[PDB]
Scaffold this motif. Structure first.
Motif, PDB file in Angstrom:
ATOM      1  N   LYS A  35       2.202   4.284   6.803  1.00 32.58           N
ATOM      2  CA  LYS A  35       0.916   3.623   6.936  1.00 32.58           C
ATOM      3  C   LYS A  35       0.998   2.541   8.000  1.00 32.58           C
ATOM      4  O   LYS A  35       2.029   1.880   8.145  1.00 32.58           O
ATOM      5  CB  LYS A  35       0.475   3.019   5.603  1.00 32.58           C
ATOM      6  CG  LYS A  35      -0.958   2.543   5.577  1.00 32.58           C
ATOM      7  CD  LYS A  35      -1.426   2.326   4.156  1.00 32.58           C
ATOM      8  CE  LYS A  35      -2.929   2.184   4.103  1.00 32.58           C
ATOM      9  NZ  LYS A  35      -3.479   1.730   5.394  1.00 32.58           N
ATOM     10  N   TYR A  38      -2.434  -3.968   9.976  1.00 38.63           N
ATOM     11  CA  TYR A  38      -2.773  -5.100  10.821  1.00 38.63           C
ATOM     12  C   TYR A  38      -2.119  -6.354  10.262  1.00 38.63           C
ATOM     13  O   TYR A  38      -2.235  -6.644   9.068  1.00 38.63           O
ATOM     14  CB  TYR A  38      -4.285  -5.296  10.914  1.00 38.63           C
ATOM     15  CG  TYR A  38      -4.682  -6.364  11.906  1.00 38.63           C
ATOM     16  CD1 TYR A  38      -4.210  -6.336  13.209  1.00 38.63           C
ATOM     17  CD2 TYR A  38      -5.514  -7.411  11.536  1.00 38.63           C
ATOM     18  CE1 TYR A  38      -4.565  -7.312  14.120  1.00 38.63           C
ATOM     19  CE2 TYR A  38      -5.874  -8.391  12.437  1.00 38.63           C
ATOM     20  CZ  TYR A  38      -5.397  -8.336  13.730  1.00 38.63           C
ATOM     21  OH  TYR A  38      -5.753  -9.310  14.634  1.00 38.63           O
ATOM     22  N   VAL A  40      -2.136 -10.216  10.447  1.00 35.84           N
ATOM     23  CA  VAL A  40      -3.052 -11.266  10.889  1.00 35.84           C
ATOM     24  C   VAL A  40      -2.300 -12.396  11.581  1.00 35.84           C
ATOM     25  O   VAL A  40      -2.738 -12.905  12.621  1.00 35.84           O
ATOM     26  CB  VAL A  40      -3.876 -11.783   9.695  1.00 35.84           C
ATOM     27  CG1 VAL A  40      -4.535 -13.111  10.033  1.00 35.84           C
ATOM     28  CG2 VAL A  40      -4.912 -10.754   9.280  1.00 35.84           C
ATOM     29  N   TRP A  45       0.166  -4.846  15.231  1.00 39.95           N
ATOM     30  CA  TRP A  45       0.163  -3.741  14.285  1.00 39.95           C
ATOM     31  C   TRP A  45       1.600  -3.324  14.017  1.00 39.95           C
ATOM     32  O   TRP A  45       2.442  -3.362  14.920  1.00 39.95           O
ATOM     33  CB  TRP A  45      -0.620  -2.535  14.817  1.00 39.95           C
ATOM     34  CG  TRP A  45      -2.108  -2.696  14.840  1.00 39.95           C
ATOM     35  CD1 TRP A  45      -2.854  -3.263  15.833  1.00 39.95           C
ATOM     36  CD2 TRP A  45      -3.039  -2.254  13.844  1.00 39.95           C
ATOM     37  NE1 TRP A  45      -4.186  -3.216  15.510  1.00 39.95           N
ATOM     38  CE2 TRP A  45      -4.327  -2.601  14.294  1.00 39.95           C
ATOM     39  CE3 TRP A  45      -2.907  -1.607  12.613  1.00 39.95           C
ATOM     40  CZ2 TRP A  45      -5.475  -2.324  13.557  1.00 39.95           C
ATOM     41  CZ3 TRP A  45      -4.048  -1.330  11.883  1.00 39.95           C
ATOM     42  CH2 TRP A  45      -5.315  -1.690  12.356  1.00 39.95           C
ATOM     43  N   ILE A  58       1.809  -5.388  -1.330  1.00 34.90           N
ATOM     44  CA  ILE A  58       1.182  -5.869  -0.105  1.00 34.90           C
ATOM     45  C   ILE A  58      -0.231  -6.354  -0.394  1.00 34.90           C
ATOM     46  O   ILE A  58      -0.686  -7.359   0.164  1.00 34.90           O
ATOM     47  CB  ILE A  58       1.206  -4.774   0.978  1.00 34.90           C
ATOM     48  CG1 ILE A  58       2.503  -4.844   1.781  1.00 34.90           C
ATOM     49  CG2 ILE A  58       0.016  -4.904   1.912  1.00 34.90           C
ATOM     50  CD1 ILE A  58       2.893  -3.533   2.426  1.00 34.90           C
ATOM     51  N   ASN A  59      -0.933  -5.671  -1.290  1.00 35.56           N
ATOM     52  CA  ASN A  59      -2.303  -6.010  -1.638  1.00 35.56           C
ATOM     53  C   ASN A  59      -2.394  -7.036  -2.759  1.00 35.56           C
ATOM     54  O   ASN A  59      -3.471  -7.211  -3.333  1.00 35.56           O
ATOM     55  CB  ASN A  59      -3.070  -4.745  -2.019  1.00 35.56           C
ATOM     56  CG  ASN A  59      -3.413  -3.892  -0.815  1.00 35.56           C
ATOM     57  OD1 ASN A  59      -3.119  -4.259   0.318  1.00 35.56           O
ATOM     58  ND2 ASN A  59      -4.015  -2.738  -1.058  1.00 35.56           N
ATOM     59  N   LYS A  60      -1.297  -7.709  -3.090  1.00 29.97           N
ATOM     60  CA  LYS A  60      -1.325  -8.805  -4.050  1.00 29.97           C
ATOM     61  C   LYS A  60      -0.863 -10.118  -3.441  1.00 29.97           C
ATOM     62  O   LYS A  60      -1.525 -11.145  -3.625  1.00 29.97           O
ATOM     63  CB  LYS A  60      -0.471  -8.465  -5.283  1.00 29.97           C
ATOM     64  CG  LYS A  60      -0.321  -9.617  -6.266  1.00 29.97           C
ATOM     65  CD  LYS A  60       0.598  -9.261  -7.421  1.00 29.97           C
ATOM     66  CE  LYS A  60       1.237 -10.497  -8.026  1.00 29.97           C
ATOM     67  NZ  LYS A  60       2.470 -10.180  -8.806  1.00 29.97           N
ATOM     68  N   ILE A  61       0.254 -10.118  -2.716  1.00 32.17           N
ATOM     69  CA  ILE A  61       0.791 -11.327  -2.104  1.00 32.17           C
ATOM     70  C   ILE A  61       0.593 -11.358  -0.601  1.00 32.17           C
ATOM     71  O   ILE A  61       0.997 -12.337   0.043  1.00 32.17           O
ATOM     72  CB  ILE A  61       2.280 -11.519  -2.445  1.00 32.17           C
ATOM     73  CG1 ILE A  61       3.131 -10.462  -1.738  1.00 32.17           C
ATOM     74  CG2 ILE A  61       2.490 -11.491  -3.945  1.00 32.17           C
ATOM     75  CD1 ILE A  61       4.619 -10.689  -1.869  1.00 32.17           C
ATOM     76  N   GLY A  62      -0.003 -10.328  -0.017  1.00 26.52           N
ATOM     77  CA  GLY A  62      -0.235 -10.300   1.409  1.00 26.52           C
ATOM     78  C   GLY A  62       0.889  -9.624   2.172  1.00 26.52           C
ATOM     79  O   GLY A  62       2.013  -9.481   1.693  1.00 26.52           O
ATOM     80  N   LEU A  63       0.559  -9.188   3.386  1.00 27.50           N
ATOM     81  CA  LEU A  63       1.531  -8.495   4.224  1.00 27.50           C
ATOM     82  C   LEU A  63       2.677  -9.415   4.623  1.00 27.50           C
ATOM     83  O   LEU A  63       3.850  -9.066   4.455  1.00 27.50           O
ATOM     84  CB  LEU A  63       0.842  -7.939   5.468  1.00 27.50           C
ATOM     85  CG  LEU A  63       1.619  -6.906   6.281  1.00 27.50           C
ATOM     86  CD1 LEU A  63       2.222  -5.839   5.380  1.00 27.50           C
ATOM     87  CD2 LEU A  63       0.743  -6.298   7.353  1.00 27.50           C
TER      88      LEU A  63
END
Ligand code: K
Ligand code: K
Ligand code: K
Ligand code: MG
Ligand code: MG
Ligand code: MG
Ligand code: MG
Ligand code: MG
Ligand code: MG
Ligand code: MG
Ligand code: MG
Ligand code: MG
Ligand code: MG
Ligand code: MG
Ligand code: MG
Ligand code: MG
Ligand code: MG
Lengths: 77, 92, 272, 52, 48
Positions: A35, A38, A40, A45, A58-63
């Motif tokens: 996958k 992005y 930030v 990328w 990744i969708n809880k603590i951020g990338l």
RNA sequence: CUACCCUUGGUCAGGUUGAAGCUGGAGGACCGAAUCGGUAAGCGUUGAAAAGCUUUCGAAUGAAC
RNA sequence: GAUCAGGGUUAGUCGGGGCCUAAGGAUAAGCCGAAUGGCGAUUCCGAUGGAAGAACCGGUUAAUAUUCCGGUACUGAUAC
RNA sequence: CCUUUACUAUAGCUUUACAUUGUAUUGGAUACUAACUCGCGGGCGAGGACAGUGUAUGGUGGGU
């Protein structure tokens, strides 16, 4: 290497068990996919090979924190 | 240590008796023609005009004991040297 | 367009070969050929994955231009040549600027004609135009599946397709197999049919001609032993049961198209 | 998936607010474009300021 | 009649020589077993 | 070794017949050495040989060796 | 054609090798994969093939001979 | 060792659910594009929350 880069998850060895209790060797594989993300903070990328469980982190603590956590434990290398 | 020894054989004595400038030595198996011309000229102080070479493997000498104890003599190279017409060499 | 041989020898009794009358040149172009290596049906591991392949005449590969990208530059047909790599014939083209190419020879295209490709080219035999610019009802070959990729469909000797209808961003085309499917209008096609239509009237005549063409003898399953084939075994001749392959694949009606392929959205009527 | 809207967004909106979306909507559309940012404590404290 | 052994020195070294043994893990495993036994002839490269 | 395949080389005395296009010279065409085989008989069976020898026989420009 | 000892194979051109590439092999960047590893170029290796560098006749020894000698040729470098 | 409508398993194929996986209108469809997939050339096309894959599950399975 078929390893998740965020969690370190790899395939585990188990058995198939039938109703007569015949046991045969099997592999439990990882829900592993590639996958693109992005980033930030870095304005770029990156493409990661992660499990669905890694995407949950990744969708809880951020990338950014996930890659920092992954690099400490030795998963991204 | 290029030159090991001169050759004193029936064939070589006849060759010298015809060509007075023709002599033959035993030399290290891994020496090339350019080096050999340098050695024979830096030790006998002559003008070497031509060098021919041949490589001899050693003769196997198989003895028996409790059998087949192999043996072999060391390999050598033969150099046939032609001097400048009018020059000689004395082995005494 | 064929030549039947007289029965002087039992091997020549039933042999029919082509007349080679459309051919105008004897040797290929130097810059467009390369030596071609043979596989015996072996893959890169060395195992034979396809049977009945092997031997035959040495052949050189010819570079066929299936894209026809030189759009707007006229070309002239110089020679019509034999090609061992395909069932049709090929034509050599000299472009006005110095390029050279080989194309499949359409039926009715002859030496000294002029051909062109592009959206502003006349719909004449041997011309390559997008399907959007090709009139309805035309005979066409060398059909692109994707724009810019190159001709893939309707290329064998004697083959043709008819453009039947327009649907906006898609056209409707009837294929040699009888199937009807929708094709993108930005794809390209060449007007005419493929030549060498009398190629299906040939008869090899003897077993030796198959070996020149690179084919090896093919064994029936009923004459083997059970260890080699599910149809083998038996005391005397047997039928072997339901026709199936070595892996047990039914050979008398099992459908093998994947039943969830996405291209089924574009197939209007089916015959294959 | 909790995010901080850095811009006014169609339907769900009112930029600089705490809103919850499905993980696909945030990770794949809002963040890569730049109409939102993930809501962590280290970013929600930078939003506790309003100074208006 | 034609017998099973038709010698070719080029084939012998390609199939059994020292450099072909060292090219794989299982070949080097063979070399380690022969050294531990004390063999005087290690490969066909020695008899030459 | 043997089975099949890939790349690169080599070999096939002499005669006969007479297709396509008086000429011409095709062919898993004919006779027959080399050669490749292995039909029938005899011999051998602690053999010269863990499959051979002699005579005979098949193919011998091809799916050839 | 046995045992022991002595002797005997001489190349600017011959055959190789040095150069080139085929089948195939090993790889680079990449791809795949419990491990060991499997794949993967126009790259390299690899003749049974291609080279724009060139020699043939005769005679001599117990044993070598386009190699030694005779005659008559040819091909690269290098210095003036 | 071989066979099959002997028994029990199993590679493979196939069904549905969850994950990958989102947004609108009107659940279930229609529609979209940004996940994801393929082509061209060095962004433009064509598809699209399907497909493919992981886990679970029913069916088939002398191929083994
Ligand atoms: K058959
Ligand atoms: K079977
Ligand atoms: K045979
Ligand atoms: Mg000389
Ligand atoms: Mg020499
Ligand atoms: Mg049988
Ligand atoms: Mg019967
Ligand atoms: Mg014949
Ligand atoms: Mg004969
Ligand atoms: Mg006959
Ligand atoms: Mg005959
Ligand atoms: Mg003697
Ligand atoms: Mg030479
Ligand atoms: Mg090379
Ligand atoms: Mg002699
Ligand atoms: Mg001579
Ligand atoms: Mg069974």
């Amino acid at each position: 290497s078929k390893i998740c880069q965020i969690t370190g998850k790899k395939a585990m060895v188990g058995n198939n068990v039938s109703h007569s209790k015949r046991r045969t060797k099997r592999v439990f594989d990882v829900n592993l996919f590639r996958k693109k993300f992005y980033w930030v903070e870095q304005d770029c990328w990156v493409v990661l090979r992660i499990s669905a469980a890694g995407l949950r982190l990744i969708n809880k603590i951020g990338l950014d924190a996930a890659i920092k956590r992954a690099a400490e434990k030795g998963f991204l290398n | 240590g290029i030159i090991i020894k001169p050759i004193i054989s029936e064939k070589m004595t006849a060759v010298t008796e015809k060509m007075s400038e023709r002599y033959g030595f035993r030399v290290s198996p891994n020496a090339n023609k350019i080096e050999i011309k340098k050695a024979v000229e830096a030790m006998y102080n002559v003008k070497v005009e031509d060098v021919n070479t041949m490589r001899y493997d050693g003769k196997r000498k198989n003895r028996y004991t409790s059998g087949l104890i192999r043996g072999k003599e060391a390999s050598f190279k033969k150099a046939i040297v032609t001097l400048k017409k009018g020059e000689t060499i004395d082995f005494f | 367009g064929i030549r039947k041989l007289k029965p002087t020898t039992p091997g020549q009794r039933h042999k029919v070969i082509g007349a080679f009358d459309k051919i105008t040149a004897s040797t290929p172009e130097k810059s467009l050929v390369v030596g071609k290596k043979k596989t015996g049906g072996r893959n890169n591991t060395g195992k034979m994955t396809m049977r009945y392949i092997g031997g035959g005449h040495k052949q050189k590969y010819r570079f066929i231009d299936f894209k026809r990208t030189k759009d707007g530059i006229p070309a002239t047909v110089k020679t019509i040549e034999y090609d061992p790599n395909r069932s049709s014939r090929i034509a050599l083209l000299y472009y006005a600027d110095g390029a050279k190419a080989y194309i499949i020879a359409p039926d009715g295209l002859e030496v000294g004609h002029t051909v062109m490709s592009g959206s502003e080219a006349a719909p004449e035999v041997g011309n390559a135009l997008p399907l959007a610019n090709i009139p309805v009802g035309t005979i066409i070959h060398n059909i692109e599946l994707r724009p810019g990729q190159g001709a893939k469909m309707v290329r064998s000797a004697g083959s043709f397709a008819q453009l039947t209808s327009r649907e906006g961003t898609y056209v409707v085309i009837k294929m040699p197999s009888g199937e009807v499917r929708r094709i993108l209008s930005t794809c390209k096609a060449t007007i005419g049919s493929v030549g060498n239509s009398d190629h299906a009237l040939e008869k090899s005549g003897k077993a030796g001609r198959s070996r020149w063409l690179g084919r090896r003898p093919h064994n029936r399953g009923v004459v083997m032993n059970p260890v080699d084939h599910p149809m083998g075994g038996g005391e005397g001749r047997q039928s072997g049961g339901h026709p199936r392959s070595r892996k047990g694949l039914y050979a008398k009606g099992l459908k093998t198209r994947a039943p969830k392929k996405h291209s089924s959205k574009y197939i209007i009527e089916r015959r294959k | 998936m909790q995010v901080i809207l850095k811009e006014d967004v169609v339907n769900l909106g009112y930029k600089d607010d705490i809103v919850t979306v499905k993980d696909g909507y945030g990770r794949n559309f809002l963040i890569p474009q730049g109409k939102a940012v993930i809501a962590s404590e280290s970013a929600k404290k930078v939003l506790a300021e309003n100074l208006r | 009649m034609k017998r099973t052994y038709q010698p070719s020195n080029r084939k012998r070294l390609n199939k059994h020589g020292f450099r072909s043994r060292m090219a794989t893990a299982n070949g080097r495993r063979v070399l380690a077993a022969r050294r531990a036994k004390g063999r005087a002839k290690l490969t066909v490269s020695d008899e030459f």
